[PDB]
Design a protein around this ligand. Structure first.
Ligand code: NAG
Ligand code: NAG
Ligand code: NAG
Length: 200
C-alpha cells in the first residue's frame, strides 16, 4: 500500500511487503525508519528499537516484518520505509524495499451543550465541551453571525493520548429569545452544535 489512514487510539499495521524465515533472520538486516529517523533495527539476529519507539511499537516478524503502532497518536503521521538486506557473499545486498505513508484522523466529536441557572436573576449558563480531537481546538460562541465573548474556556492536551479537550461557559439573559452556535475550529476543519432559547 502507498497510503494508510487510521483513527487515534487505534492500531496501525505497516507491512514491509516482504517475509523472511527464522533461519535467514540470522543473515538478514532490517531497517525500519520514519522519514530518515530510525525506528527499529533487526541487525542479523539482534533487534534494537530506539527509545522514541520502545513503548508503543511492536515488530511483527511473522507478518511480513511489519511494525504495528499501538494506540495511535496524531504525531505517528509520516512516511515509513522498510529496507531488508541479504548477505550476498562478501557484503549486504538489499533484496527489498517497501514504503508507506501513515495518516492519522483525529476528528472532534460533535460538542454537547449543558444549560442551567446561576444565582443571578434571568441569567442562564451554557457549557459547550468536546474532546478526543487534534490539533488544538478553538472555541467561539455565535449569536446572529456575531462572536460573543466567552466567560471561561479551558483547553488541555493529554500527555498520553496526545489529544485535546475544550470546554467553555457562556451566560445570557433569559428574558429574550436566543439561538447560539458553539463553533469549534481545529486545523482547517470545524465542528459545532447549537442552543435554542425560547423565552415565554
Ligand atoms: C473555569 O472553569 C473551570 C471548569 O468549570 C474551573 O475549574 C475554573 O476554576 C474556572 N476558572 C476560573 C478563573 O474561574
Ligand atoms: C436581564 O434582562 C432584563 C430584561 O431585558 C434587563 O432589564 C436586565 O438588565 C438584564 N440583566 C442582565 C444582567 O442582562
Ligand atoms: C454546524 O454543524 C452542522 C452539523 O454538522 C453543519 O451542518 C453546519 O454546517 C455547521 N455550521 C457552521 C457555520 O459551521
Amino acid at each position: 500500500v502507498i497510503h494508510v489512514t487510521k483513527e487515534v487510539k487505534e492500531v496501525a499495521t505497516l507491512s514491509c511487503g516482504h517475509n523472511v524465515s527464522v533461519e535467514e533472520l540470522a543473515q538478514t538486516r532490517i531497517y525500519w525508519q520514519k522519514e530518515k529517523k530510525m525506528v527499529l533495527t533487526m541487525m542479523s539476529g539482534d533487534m534494537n528499537i530506539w527509545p522514541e519507539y520502545k513503548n508503543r511499537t511492536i515488530f511483527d516478524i511473522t507478518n511480513n516484518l511489519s511494525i504495528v503502532i499501538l494506540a495511535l497518536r496524531p504525531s505517528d503521521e509520516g512516511t515509513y520505509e522498510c529496507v531488508v538486506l541479504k548477505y550476498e557473499k562478501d557484503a549486504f545486498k538489499r533484496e527489498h524495499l517497501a514504503e508507506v505513508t501513515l495518516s492519522v484522523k483525529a476528528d472532534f466529536p460533535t460538542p454537547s451543550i449543558s444549560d442551567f441557572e446561576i444565582p443571578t436573576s434571568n441569567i442562564r449558563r451554557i457549557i459547550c465541551s468536546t474532546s478526543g480531537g487534534f490539533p488544538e481546538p478553538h472555541l467561539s460562541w455565535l449569536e446572529n453571525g456575531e462572536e460573543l465573548n466567552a466567560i471561561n474556556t479551558t483547553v488541555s492536551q493529554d500527555p498520553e493520548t496526545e489529544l485535546y479537550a475544550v470546554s467553555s461557559k457562556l451566560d445570557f439573559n433569559m428574558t429574550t429569545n436566543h439561538s447560539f452556535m458553539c463553533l469549534i475550529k481545529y486545523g482547517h476543519l470545524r465542528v459545532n452544535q447549537t442552543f435554542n432559547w425560547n423565552t415565554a
